[PDB]
Structure formats: C-alpha cells, structure tokens
Design a protein around this nucleic acid. Structure first.
Ligand code: MG
Ligand code: MG
Ligand code: MG
Ligand code: MG
Ligand code: MG
Lengths: 37, 175, 63, 171, 136
RNA sequence: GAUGUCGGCUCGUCGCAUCCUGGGGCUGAAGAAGGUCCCAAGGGUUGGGCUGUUCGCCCAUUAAAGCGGCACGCGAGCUG
RNA sequence: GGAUGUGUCGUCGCGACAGCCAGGAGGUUGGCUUAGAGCAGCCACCCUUCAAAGAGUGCGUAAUAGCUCACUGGUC
C-alpha cells in the first residue's frame, strides 16, 4: 500500500474506485495499489 | 453568418454568445456584430484566404474577407474581428500560409524539415481566385537546402511580396 | 534469407543505419533461387507475391 | 439497465407496503427496498420501473431487479458455494452441522453456521456451503476462506472450484 | 540563462501580458495562466527535461530570457544598503505569455514534453494549437 | 519604579512527524531475521565513564533506550 | 496535484460498445548492436493469403515459451 497525493493510472488494469470519501485504485498488480488516504 | 444587431453598446452581446466585428472598404464603414459560434466555425476553414456570405438583418448580402483578428488573452476565445469588403479587381494584399506535402529526402537521412516562415504574404491576390493554400515541393531538399520564395510555384496571376531570397523552408541538422 | 543475401552481395555484416549508409545492391535473379529453395516456408501464392515478400526483407536490411 | 425478470410458479411476490414478502417451497424470504421505486408483477413476468432517469434512481433500479432475482432463484433451486481444501495435512470434519477446520493451526478452528445456513462435506478435502439467502451463503462461506488466505507460493488454504492463484515462488 | 552585461539592480511590478503570442517558430506552444517570476534555473529545468524526451531535433525554442536581477539576504542584520547583488535572474511572465514551443514531433510526443516541463513551474500552464495570424 | 539567565536535581502533563510493545497493505516477503508505508499516544522508554554541559562519544545491557511543547516547563521548590 | 462525485453548456466519431465462445499469421529467429526472436537501444513499420490475424500494447525469462490486445464472425 502506497499513499500518494497524486494517484494516477500506471497500466491498463488500474481502476479508480470512489468509496467512502476516499480515492482508491484496485488492480491485478498488487504493487499498483495507490490510495490518497 | 446571419449578422443582425450592430449597435455601439456591447451590453447586449457580452453575456450571450456574440462577437464584435467591423467590415469596411472605403465607401461604407458600418459597425457590425456577428455571432460567436457562427464565426468560430467559419473562420476555422476559410481563415483569411476565403470570403464568406455576410447577410445583415433585412436582406443585405455583402462579400468580405477577414483581415486581422485580435485574440482575447488568457482565453482562446476571440473578442474582435476585422473584415474587408472584396473590391473585384485589386483590393488588398492577402497572406497565404505554406503547407508541406510529400516526405523529404532529408527527414529520412537524419535531418528534420523546419518551416522558417509559416505565413507568406504576397502582392495582388486577385479577387474570385484567392489562394486558400500553397503546396511547396520539399522532397528535392537534403541537408542544409534552403528553399526561398523564388522557388515556390505561383497560384497563377499572383506575385510575391517578400524578398525573393527569403528562406521559407529549411531542413535543420539532427540534435 | 539474410544469410543468403550476405553471401550473394558479399555483405560482411549489415548496416546500423540503413537510413544514411546502406550496403549493396542485387538483382531479381538472385531472388528466384531464394523463393525456390525456401518453398515449404512460403505461402505466397504465385509468382510475384512471393517475389514481393523477399523484397520487404532486403528493404529493411540495406539492399 | 435491467427489465427482464424470470418468474416461476413456485414463487410468490407480495408488494405489500415497504416490505416485499416472497414465498417459496425452499422457504419464505423477505427483501425490503424503496418506496419511490415502483415495482409490480405485470401480467405474467415481473417488471421494475423507475420514476426518473438519471442515476439516483437507475443505480437503485438494477439493484432491486437483481436482489429480487436472487430471492426467486433462492426459493426455487437454492444457492450452494463449493469450496476446496488444498495443501498438506489440510482437512475438515463435521460436528452435527458445524464445520470443523484443521489446517496447520495447532488447534482446530470451530466454525458454526447461523440460522438458515447448513454445511456439507463430500470429502476431507472439499467444503460445500448451502443456504437459502444468496447473501448469507456468501457471507458465511467467506468467513471460511478468511481462515487461511491462499499464500503466494503454494496457494493453500481455502478456495473456490479452481481459483486462479498464480505462484510468486521463493526461488 | 543569465545576461552578459547589465546595470545590476531593479524593482518589481506585474501588469498584464503585452508581447506574448499564441504561435510562432513552430506548431505547438505552451502558455502560462498565472503571473509569477520564472527563475533562470527553472528554465534550465524545463529545457533539459524536454531534451531528455527528444533524442534528436533541437527544435525547442525559449524566448523568455531572464532580464531581471534579484537581491538576497547574506546573513542577518539590517544595518546596510543593497544586499546581495548576485543572486539569481528571473524572467517575468504574464498569463498569455508563451514560454515554450516545439515542433516536428507528433501530438502525443508534445503532450508529454510540455506536461513534464510543467510540473517544475511555479504556475499553471496549458498547451495550445495553431489558428493565429496576427502580424508577420 | 525588575518578565531572575544556562545545566542538573525534583515534580509532571500534553501533541504526534511512533524508539519499543499491538492491528494491517505491499516487498527484490520461502522460513527466520528485515525494509517501507498506513492506523494507533494505553503504558513503558535502564545503569555508568568524560564534560557545567544542553549535545555527543564510549562501556555494559535492553522490546525500547523517541522526537518537541509547556517563559529552550519548573530558582516565593533545591543546587550555583 | 489527483479522481467514472454531481449540475449545466460545447468539440471531435461510431446492427456498435462492454461481456461471452472461437481465431490469431506464413515471410520471421525482420535488418542491426551484443557473451544473447511484438515488448533494452538503433531503423523501418514492406509484402502475401483472407469473411481476417498491426513485423505490434502490457505482464515474463539469461534468450526461449506462455498468457492477451488491435482486426473478424456468431448470440442477445
Ligand atoms: Mg516583581
Ligand atoms: Mg498518525
Ligand atoms: Mg519473515
Ligand atoms: Mg550520574
Ligand atoms: Mg526557563
């Protein structure tokens, strides 16, 4: 889990998910788990 | 472009999608006021080397050619436009832009084709037959070759304006 | 087919820059034997199309 | 958007108030929804209409359409998730109706089903979670899987069917 | 980068854009949207970075030479006059001033170079396209 | 017509950018032992040599020997 | 700075699009650089068969392979 103020795509599997007031990104590649919180 | 109102108070223009402009030649200098979208779609095509029908509110079709366009800063949206009524034999000097067709024999070798001057003004465009574009042979160029205005084929019935030895296009060296 | 071209035109290696300095130049006759030896490896369908197949290889090689 | 809805004789849709009661041979199941979201059985099949066509209504449209289909299929045939026990020394027994874990841990982990869910062993090396409510069936089976998450080197623990779990490997 | 010879000192004042144009000496350009001070060093930042993304070409123009010397605080105190003659050069830049412009490359190849050379800048910028024909 | 100055001793309390204890994500995480990040201030956070020292170095250990504030806390409380 | 959070105006183009079943090149192991083939970097990005498969997207190995996409058909 990498907390980055600037969460952007890195491949063709990164999917931005808007949950409970938070910016998350799910992806087959676990190293691509970016989250602003 | 169905031109309509033409006052001096833009109060009935700025909030809405309208753009101020003026057309003249010599005899008549009536201020106008065309539409925003109408112009931002026409000018994209004919630019300043193509005339378009300008019918004022009431039934007055007046042929004119875009001259100079001031651009609002900080925004791409224009704010003022100048038109020039077409005379019929000799009217004004029109600027014609230079394009490029065919791959050069310099782009492959390693160099890259760079146009020194994009817009090239000429003398006596001749109404009814205004060159909307200009195709220049670039393939004959290699490494360091300079193609001035004295090498560009004429539209026909038109003359150059800039120095005959003014480099229009040049292939620069790599890196 | 590259090995055959390097023996026909007498190419030692090739060309790092086929855009500036090429290698050599051959004739269509040498192409005939190439499409005649590597038939099982070629689809191409009669005549020229096989002939134009090899041309594409020599073009990006320096011939 | 979703409009087709499979309705068969064995079910019983009751759009009474806010509580949409549904009866069946497998057992009666209750599924509550919204009031503004119109829904009824038109003729033979069932249709779910929506007042307004933006998002606040469409998001609930498919929502209800699916949940109702889940209650139907649940009272018609029923849901049964089939797990699997893969690894060395990994096995599971049964105590009356509660599933008994035994996977690497010193002490066996006892897992007791809630009210309406029942476990089944075919095998020492397979698990089968059966139930009525499609939500409960998953909610329960899940807990089972949480016990031992497939490790990225051998893929042990509990999985579905075949799970696709690629091995990272030591080495 | 730095001037070859000047007076030395200056002042400070920010009015609207004057001599900035939408397009020249190329096809694509990059324009600021906020007034600020663009340090010399920041320009090297942009130029070098765009040269990493462009192996060959050299079609990168920078017509915003810094012509504005700035003072600096040497240590402490305030019992003195002009302090720090030689610090850094800054080139003023107003919304609608073109800083950078490239050509020869495609569309994608240009959206990257300006992008990158945009994060270094103290201000926001946007990349534009042709359709301007004022004076020439 | 006065807001006693450094350090120490004494007595505490608070914040979280957590030194060690707990609960997680990822790993170039096999295991063990670590790295990094996120959550979390309940409690703990040793004894000595040199120096006024604050620091810091060193000895011997420890899960750990945290970083700041409170007038660089505290002299109508003590040392000087 | 970042994001399928919404409301309201605009600019490009399209039996789709997403999904699902099936297919995926033969030239080729392109030429070249190196201890050494869609995917380190130089260069190109040509031809053929076809209702059709771009010498090419990502992950991967010391290269290999393999898993897929762009492109085609079918079922709603
Ligand atoms: Mg006093
Ligand atoms: Mg915290
Ligand atoms: Mg370990
Ligand atoms: Mg002591
Ligand atoms: Mg004090």
């Amino acid at each position: 889990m990498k907390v980055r103020s600037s969460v952007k795509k890195m491949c063709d599997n990164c999917k931005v998910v808007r949950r409970h007031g938070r910016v998350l990104v799910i992806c087959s590649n676990v190293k691509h788990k970016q989250r602003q919180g | 472009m169905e031109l309509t109102a033409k006052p001096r108070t833009p109060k009935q223009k700025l909030d809405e999608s309208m753009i101020a402009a003026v057309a003249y030649n010599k005899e008549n200098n009536v201020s106008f006021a065309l539409d925003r979208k109408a112009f931002d779609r026409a000018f994209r095509q004919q630019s300043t080397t193509g005339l378009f029908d300008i019918t004022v509110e009431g039934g007055e079709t007046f042929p004119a050619l875009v001259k100079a366009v001031q651009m609002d800063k900080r925004k791409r949206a224009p704010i003022h436009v100048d038109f020039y009524m077409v005379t019929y034999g000799e009217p004004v000097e029109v600027s014609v832009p230079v394009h490029t067709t065919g791959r050069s024999q310099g782009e492959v070798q390693g160099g890259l084709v760079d146009i020194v001057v994009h817009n090239l003004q000429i003398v006596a465009p001749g109404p009814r037959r205004i060159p909307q574009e200009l195709v220049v042979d670039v393939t004959k160029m290699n490494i360091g070759d300079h193609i001035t205005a004295g090498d560009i084929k004429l539209p026909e019935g038109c003359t150059l304006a800039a120095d005959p030895e003014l480099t229009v296009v040049s292939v620069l060296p790599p890196r | 087919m590259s090995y055959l071209i390097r023996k026909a035109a007498g190419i030692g290696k090739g060309s790092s820059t086929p855009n500036k300095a090429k290698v050599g130049k051959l004739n269509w006759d040498q192409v005939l034997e190439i499409a005649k030896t590597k038939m099982p490896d070629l689809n191409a369908g009669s005549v020229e199309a096989a002939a134009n197949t090899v041309a594409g290889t020599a073009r990006s090689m320096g011939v | 958007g979703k409009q087709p809805i499979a309705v068969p004789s064995g079910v019983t849709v009751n759009a009474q108030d806010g509580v949409f009661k549904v009866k069946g041979p497998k057992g009666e199941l209750t599924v509550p929804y919204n009031t503004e979201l119109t829904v009824r059985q038109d003729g033979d099949q069932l249709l779910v209409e929506r007042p307004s066509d933006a998002q606040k209504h469409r998001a609930l449209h498919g929502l209800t359409r699916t949940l109702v289909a889940n209650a139907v299929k649940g009272v018609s045939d029923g849901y049964t998730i089939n797990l699997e026990l893969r690894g060395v020394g990994f096995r599971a027994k049964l105590t009356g109706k509660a599933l008994e874990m035994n996977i690497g841990y010193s002490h066996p982990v006892i897992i007791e089903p809630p009210a309406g869910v029942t476990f089944a062993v075919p095998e020492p090396t397979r698990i089968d979670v059966s139930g009525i409510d499609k939500q409960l069936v998953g909610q329960v089976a899940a807990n089972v899987r949480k016990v031992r998450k497939p490790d990225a080197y051998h893929g042990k623990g509990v999985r579905f069917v075949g799970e696709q779990i690629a091995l990272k490997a030591g080495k | 980068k730095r001037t070859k010879f000047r007076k030395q000192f200056r002042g400070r004042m920010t009015g609207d854009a004057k001599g900035g144009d939408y397009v020249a000496f190329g096809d694509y350009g990059l324009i600021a949207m906020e007034p600020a001070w663009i340090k010399s060093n920041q320009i090297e930042a942009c130029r070098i970075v765009m040269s990493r993304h462009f192996r060959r070409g050299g079609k990168i123009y920078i017509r915003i030479f810094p012509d504005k010397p700035v003072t600096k605080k040497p240590a402490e105190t305030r019992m003195g006059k002009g302090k720090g003659a030689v610090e850094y050069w800054v080139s003023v830049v107003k919304p609608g001033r073109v800083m950078f412009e490239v050509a020869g490359v495609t569309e994608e190849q240009a959206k990257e170079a300006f992008r990158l050379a945009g994060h270094k800048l103290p201000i926001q910028t946007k990349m534009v396209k042709r359709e301007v024909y004022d004076e020439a």
